[PDB]
């Protein structure tokens, strides 16, 4: 009688992929890990606090209004379906508002009812303490994995509203890479330099397909399932060193990862894959502005009159911090060049994590 929230999951994931595209574009060929689901989870929560042109810009970017019937229920069910079978993966969302602000009568009751979460109230005029509170919330709600948020340096005595999203991922594989097969090998960076990096190897039947962009750039695509069938990592790797990674990045979508999943066939392959541990903290302001959400960051343009009548109120700071770890726990795919990965929840198509590994 109920089907997975794949509609919402796709809508949320595609918005998050577009945010990633903005982050990846502006990055100077450097490592970037990110959570499309996470930035969407947070912005959707923010939708409940905004009104007017601020809300307009957000729903127009995301492609849905949280006002509509069951969008929240879907999202809450989505989250808990996501975290159901899960120290392998931990995530947190948090909105911190100035304690002094008069909040609109029925907001918190509504916000908790929808999302089973609370808007945190802290005094930013006590700068050190507000910084402490946020960093503590993040560290403790990611099982210690995300300990600091350097972006909280931009907090000061005029900060009134701050949003935060943090995720850690370190998943065990369904088929482990043998410890013995781990070896050092040159990895060819995009700027032409090589580094010796440790690399895992495994011969096995992997879900695979070739993918070539409309302009002709050619990629190997491989599915690595996690020890729970629930999640999969997709590796998209340039067929040869010379093929640039950004051609694929600038046309990714959630729909597209699903098509790959649809085409893939299980074929015998030697996979050689670098061990890596990547951490990224993104200031989400510029990325979100590039997608049309400008009023939320501006003191007297922003409309937060579903959270408070008092102004000036705008988003002083919006940060995502993501840490991902990947280790062992006839035809060859040797990933000794930059590549893109995507961690996907298969029952909904939710793109949990996405990144470019420019240097392991």
């Amino acid at each position, epitope marked *: 009688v109920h089907h997975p929230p794949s509609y919402v999951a796709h809508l949320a994931s595609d918005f998050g992929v577009r945010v990633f595209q903005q982050v990846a574009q502006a990055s100077k060929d450097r490592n970037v890990v990110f959570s499309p689901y996470g930035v969407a989870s947070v912005l959707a929560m923010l939708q409940l606090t905004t009104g007017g042109e601020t809300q307009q810009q957000i729903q127009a970017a995301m492609g849905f209004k949280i006002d509509d019937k069951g969008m929240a229920p879907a999202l809450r069910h989505l989250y808990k379906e996501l975290m159901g079978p899960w120290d392998e993966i931990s995530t947190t969302d948090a909105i911190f508002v100035q304690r002094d602000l008069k909040l609109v009568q029925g907001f918190m009751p509504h916000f908790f009812r929808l999302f089973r979460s609370t808007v945190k109230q802290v005094d930013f005029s006590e700068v050190e303490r507000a910084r402490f509170i946020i960093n503590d919330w993040v560290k403790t709600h990611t099982k210690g994995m995300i300990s600091h948020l350097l972006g909280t340096g931009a907090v000061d005595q005029l900060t009134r509203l701050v949003l935060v999203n943090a995720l850690y991922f370190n998943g065990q594989w369904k088929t482990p890479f043998p410890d013995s097969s781990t070896h050092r090998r040159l990895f060819h960076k995009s700027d032409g330099s090589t580094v010796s990096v440790p690399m895992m190897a495994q011969t096995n039947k992997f879900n695979y*397909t*070739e*993918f*070539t*962009t*409309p*302009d*002709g*750039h*050619y990629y190997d695509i491989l599915e690595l399932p996690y020890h729970g069938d629930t999640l999969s990592m997709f590796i998209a790797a340039p067929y040869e060193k*010379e*093929v640039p990674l950004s051609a694929l990045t600038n*046309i990714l979508s959630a*729909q*597209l990862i699903s*098509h*790959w999943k649809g*085409n893939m066939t299980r074929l015998p392959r030697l996979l050689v894959l670098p061990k890596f541990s990547l951490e990224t903290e993104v200031d989400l302001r510029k990325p979100l502005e590039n997608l049309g959400m400008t009023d939320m960051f501006r003191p007297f343009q922003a409309d937060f009159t579903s959270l408070s009548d008092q102004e000036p109120l705008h988003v002083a700071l919006a940060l995502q911090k993501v840490k991902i770890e990947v280790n062992e726990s006839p035809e060859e795919i040797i990933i000794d060049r930059p590549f893109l990965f995507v961690v996907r929840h298969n029952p909904t198509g939710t793109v949990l994590f996405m990144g470019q590994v420019m240097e392991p």
Partner: nanobody
Amino acid sequence: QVQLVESGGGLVQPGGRLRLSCAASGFTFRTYAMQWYRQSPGTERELVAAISNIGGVTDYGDSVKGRFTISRDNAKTTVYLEMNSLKPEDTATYYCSAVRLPQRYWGRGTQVTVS
């Protein structure tokens, strides 16, 4: 061995439609992006439409978006270009290209005339 043969071009009244096709052979079609270009005397060759190997990711030149649709079938090793609401401006030789960098192949062209 490698062959790209376009067909379907001809004369059509303004506001009309045409479907071009391009039969291909001798390479791994299903791993190539397929593209349509157009060219007349005096005016530079230009991209008309492009399509990924799978997933139907498409790209269109600005002149033709919302009128022309590219599609493909990998089992038939054929690519198509439906043209609608044709205009005199669309008069040109349309050429099919397959591309999997650094490899690119070209067809022989088919004439489309709208007057």
